[PDB]
Write a protein that binds this ligand. Structure first.
Ligand code: ADP
Length: 488
């Protein structure tokens, strides 16, 4: 009931963030700390971070051949030991395994060779009685490395490791010839062994970090009970890949959100701050502000749909694009924000091209506009092919922007038909294709939603969306309940 928890991962918010691998490592740790636990977060140091004080300690780490020395910078925040692995690989305007071999290894060092009494309730060295939580493929090998170099000769021993699957789309798939460069022994080789892209003319033996991660760990996890069930089942399509393997007894906990960064009542990018009680009328102002900014006609009576995502197959921009002509039979505005492929970037761009005054396709990392979008949009459209957690709909609801979404993944957990949004049905999972039945559902659902807008029930829906707790408080209790199971 009083465990030491060490979180490892490539990205770590606020410092190194892009996808919701960042947010997870930024928010879950302190929430877990606030539950009276010794909680640490090891991740690489990508830049010369300000509150990042070198604690001088250095390990030397065996990578391929070269013996590599790492610096350990520290910053101790929010009840949480934030540790940063320093090294010149971690600064690059290939040698990809190297860096994260570094990472997993260094992360095995910081628990012992660091004395850190900053915590008012816990002193000394973290110990060798740990629970490791490994995140995404980048940390796969850690479980392995621990059994290789520690458990045989008395170090850690009764410790355990949980592997968290943030997105099955990225597995860390490498040449099988590159194996030995991990200074792990053959026993573990079999766990990495992968037959990639079978039957297709590109099939090839491969090394798979996630696979290793998954197979070697004491407990496996993902970011959503429905996603867990989608995997355990068969739907395990990471798009290009499929099933990877008969996944076994995996466990899913819905993510929380960074409720401080996204807080309509304190947000500083948007024209009008609000809570649930003034949402409707402030959202109108934000909406018009948005309408201007997007050079669309300013009119609060026009329902505005929003799409915000990386323009990749997983987030269904092609599908969104196909549905536009249909929706343009209605008096509605659609604002899309994201950046990804070319084919999609121009798919949307052509849509703006065809209906100006009604469609605006924006292509950039405009964080300010995302906020503005969240504040002013009436519905968020999230036609995902697959969706492990989803941060966009959590953000949306926080801002009272109900969601019309694909009935896949974490959206099934977080978006309730009638209370906080509108399910669309599940989309064809053949990423490379655009099912006309899908184009139909998407269109259809969006039409319903926009018809709801600006009616009493809609305002209730908004209120529901705002009145949830989407902090890490509830999540963190679920996580710990799992980290309990692990005996340590
Ligand atoms: N153009 C953009 N500008 C600002 N933020 C963006 C943009 N595109 C995506 N995002 C943010 O990144 C996320 C998109 O999906 P993401 O969570 O990265 O999926 P995954 O974690 O599976 O990679 C959203 O949560 C959104 O807030």
């Amino acid at each position: 009931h009083h465990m030491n928890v060490v979180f490892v991962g490539a990205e770590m918010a606020p410092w190194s963030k892009t996808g919701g691998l960042g947010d997870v490592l930024g928010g879950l740790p302190p929430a877990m700390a606030a539950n009276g636990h010794r909680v640490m977060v090891i991740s690489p140091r990508y830049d010369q971070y300000k509150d990042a004080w070198d604690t001088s300690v250095v390990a030397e780490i065996k990578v391929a051949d070269r013996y590599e020395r790492v610096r350990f910078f520290h910053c101790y925040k929010r009840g949480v030991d934030r540790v940063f692995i320093d090294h010149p690989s971690f600064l690059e305007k290939k040698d990809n395994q190297m860096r994260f071999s570094l990472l997993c290894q260094a992360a095995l060092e910081a628990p012992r060779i660091l004395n850190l009494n900053n915590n008012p309730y816990f002193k000394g060295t973290y110990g060798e009685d740990v629970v490791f939580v490994c995140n995404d493929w980048h940390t796969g090998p850690l479980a392995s490395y621990l059994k290789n170099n520690y458990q045989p000769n008395g170090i850690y021993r009764n410790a355990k490791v949980a592997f968290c699957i943030h997105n099955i789309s990225y597995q860390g798939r490498f040449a099988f010839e590159d194996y030995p460069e991990l200074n792990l022994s053959e026993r573990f080789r079999s766990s990495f062994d992968f037959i990639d892209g079978y039957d297709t003319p590109v099939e090839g033996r491969k090394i798979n970090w996630m696979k290793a991660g998954i197979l070697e760990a004491d407990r496996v996890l993902t970011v959503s009970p429905y996603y867990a069930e989608e995997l355990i089942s068969g739907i395990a399509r990471g798009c290009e890949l499929d099933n990877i393997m008969r996944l076994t007894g995996i466990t899913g906990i819905v993510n929380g959100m960074d409720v401080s960064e996204w807080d309509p009542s304190k947000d500083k990018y948007i024209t009008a701050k609000y809570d649930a009680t003034t949402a409707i009328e402030a959202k109108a102002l934000n909406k018009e502000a948005l309408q201007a900014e997007a050079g669309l006609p300013v009119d609060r009576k026009i329902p505005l749909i929003a799409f915000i995502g990386r323009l990749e197959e997983q987030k269904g921009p092609d599908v969104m694009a196909a549905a536009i002509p249909e929706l343009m039979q209605e008096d509605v505005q659609i604002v899309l924000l994201g950046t990804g492929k070319k084919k999609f970037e121009k798919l949307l761009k052509s849509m703006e091209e065809k209906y100006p005054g009604k469609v605006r396709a924006v292509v950039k990392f405009n964080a300010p506009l995302a906020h503005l979008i969240m504040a002013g949009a009436d519905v968020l459209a999230v036609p995902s092919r697959f969706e492990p957690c989803g941060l966009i709909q959590l953000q949306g609801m926080r801002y009272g922007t109900p969601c019309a979404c694909a009935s896949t993944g974490g959206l099934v957990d977080t978006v309730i038909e009638g209370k906080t949004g509108f399910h669309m049905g599940r989309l064809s999972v053949d990423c490379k294709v655009v099912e006309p039945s899908d184009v139909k559902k998407v269109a259809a659902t969006l039409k319903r939603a926009i018809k709801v807008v600006g009616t009493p029930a809609y305002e209730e829906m908004v209120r529901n969306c705002m009145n949830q707790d989407l902090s890490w408080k509830g999540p963190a209790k679920n996580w710990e309940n799992v980290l309990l199971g692990l005996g340590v």
